[PDB]
Design a binder for this molecule. Structure first.
Ligand code: B71
Ligand code: B71
Ligand code: IPE
Ligand code: MG
Ligand code: MG
Ligand code: MG
Ligand code: MG
Lengths: 299, 298
């Protein structure tokens, strides 16, 4: 009867129930308790005009990738909070959270084959998906390397921006490239690239500016953020050796101490003027769009 | 206007990625490489893929397998892998997670180097997508049972389905790709499933028996084949104290050798879970070694 049971098992597809599906989803469902990623999709479809069926799936794909990457990013950044709530790995544990997020990457991958049945086009959608997830990992990998090997390598603004094109551009380009390929209707990748860059620097700027006015978690993480990259390279360039070292020392403290975090912010405001330099950099990037009268980037 | 020219050129180019950056983030992966091909070769005696293709099927499987191990070691808190320190303890959990995941997608990339045939590619990618979804499901269950014990005490049946997913995942992936690429009998899938099952129960068994004679599965808290049998056997025979002591030890996440040895001797003399397992393994191997009407074997 034992041999019968095995015979049966090995001849069937692996058993997986609905209840099992729920167990594995808990870490992902928790972050869902968190519509502007979709506002941009909706808006771009005015150009692309994908039928609502196809569009919804693109939206589901983007949602799984976005959410999953955030679940793993918080494990990678040791973040206690996300969207004001406790992060999933602190509730379900790092193990289940890593596994559930990765599981969702593959669920997203599965949705990609339900956008089309056209074999040339299907290949294309997969290549896009594959190429941008590879790019998201390269950027994430470099962002983490610099942070965990600090002070071995201090990136420059250029190195930083190439990291951003990969890390933050990945999902923006993946979304748009999928829509342009599905479109039955100039490419907007340059503009989505510009948008993702503005997006990452704003995220890095706001993380510091909300605290000065915000937990300033980036400091606790030791992150080579945009204002930090500028402050470090500014002090190196002006010989401000002790400030250079003081910034490194605070980054390396992986501190949650309110006071010390404040000391580093005051270094960036009074000494290097990095926060004002970032606010300005952003504005410039936006102006590029606000003053695109020929519509070279804009549709 | 020079910065704008710089920004303009940036956004109009593919993202920049140097071979240097490629090495810096390959560290956790390069490390586990310092420590399969045979099963792929024997199986090919039947599928006859040309050597150019077989080598790619092989790089794919290596990438997926080593990546699975990197992640597995983080999820299981393993200090050792193949006699050496685990990558996460050297480079940190963050880099190891990201690199391991990076390699899953590199492996996916390679799939398109297997054929130009659009219909076939679509099937290769589906097989790849299905078995990785399966691996994750299995791993999900193994990890949930362990980390929330005793919310769920799995039965032998549940363990086996978890294994069909978890371990059968890569075995089936390897085999389904080959069957799909073959230029030349019945599917060898059931055989490959039985092999994944023997491989896992054997792994669980050897982890304890080699210590009895570091029993890291005890430290980890894994609902291993021997442990599932003991937990169910104890409840069934009404050995309340033993059932609870097994759980208590598992929940300690202990590295105390005497404590691990106590658990092992409990499965040895009190529940006869070790003998049950050894014999279950023998029976399974017997299913193949006595397959005279080649219902499993080719
Ligand atoms: C048009 C599609 C929009 C999709 C939703 C927005 C996608 C933003 C993608 C950002 O990608 C990453 C990559 C790596 C890490 N993160 C998380 C950041 P945070 O914790 O500050 O929110 P990070 O830790 O990189 O600062 C995000
Ligand atoms: C033709 C196939 C070539 C590859 C064969 C791979 C065989 C082993 C597959 C095991 O798959 C998994 C899945 C999940 C976790 N593990 C790691 C095991 P261990 O740490 O004991 O080595 P597990 O943690 O599941 O006991 C392994
Ligand atoms: C993780 C980064 C860098 C931004 C992702 O999008 P947003 O952070 O702005 O939106 P939600 O996290 O609230 O989904
Ligand atoms: Mg983060
Ligand atoms: Mg991050
Ligand atoms: Mg393990
Ligand atoms: Mg495991």
């Amino acid at each position: 009867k034992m041999e019968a049971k095995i015979d049966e098992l090995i001849n069937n597809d692996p058993v997986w129930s609905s209840q099992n599906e729920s167990l594995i989803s808990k870490p992902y469902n928790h972050i869902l308790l968190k519509n502007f990623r979709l506002n941009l999709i909706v808006q771009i479809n005015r150009v692309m005009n994908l039928p609502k069926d196809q569009l919804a799936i693109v939206s589901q794909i983007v949602e799984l990738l976005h959410n999953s990457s955030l679940l793993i990013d918080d494990i990678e950044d040791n973040a206690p909070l996300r969207r004001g709530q406790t992060t999933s790995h602190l509730i379900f544990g790092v193990p289940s959270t890593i596994n559930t997020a990765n599981y969702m990457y593959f669920r997203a991958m599965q949705l990609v084959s339900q956008l089309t049945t056209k074999e040339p086009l299907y290949h294309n959608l997969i290549t896009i998906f594959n190429e941008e997830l590879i790019n998201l990992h390269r950027g994430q990998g470099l962002d983490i390397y610099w942070r965990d090997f600090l002070p071995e390598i201090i990136p420059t603004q250029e190195m930083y921006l190439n990291m951003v094109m990969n890390k933050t551009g990945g999902l923006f380009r993946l979304t748009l490239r999928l829509m342009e390929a599905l479109s039955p209707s100039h490419s907007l990748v340059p503009f989505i690239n510009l948008l993702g860059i503005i997006y990452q620097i704003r995220d890095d700027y706001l993380n510091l500016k909300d605290f000065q006015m915000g937990f300033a978690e980036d400091i606790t993480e030791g992150k080579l953020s945009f204002p930090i990259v500028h402050a470090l390279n500014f002090t190196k360039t002006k010989g401000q050796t002790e400030q250079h070292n003081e910034i490194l020392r605070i980054l390396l403290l992986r501190t949650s101490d309110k006071d010390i975090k404040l000391k580093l912010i005051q270094i960036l405001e009074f000494d290097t003027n990095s926060l004002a330099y970032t606010k300005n950099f952003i504005n410039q990037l936006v102006n590029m769009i606000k003053n695109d009268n020929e519509n070279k980037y804009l549709p």
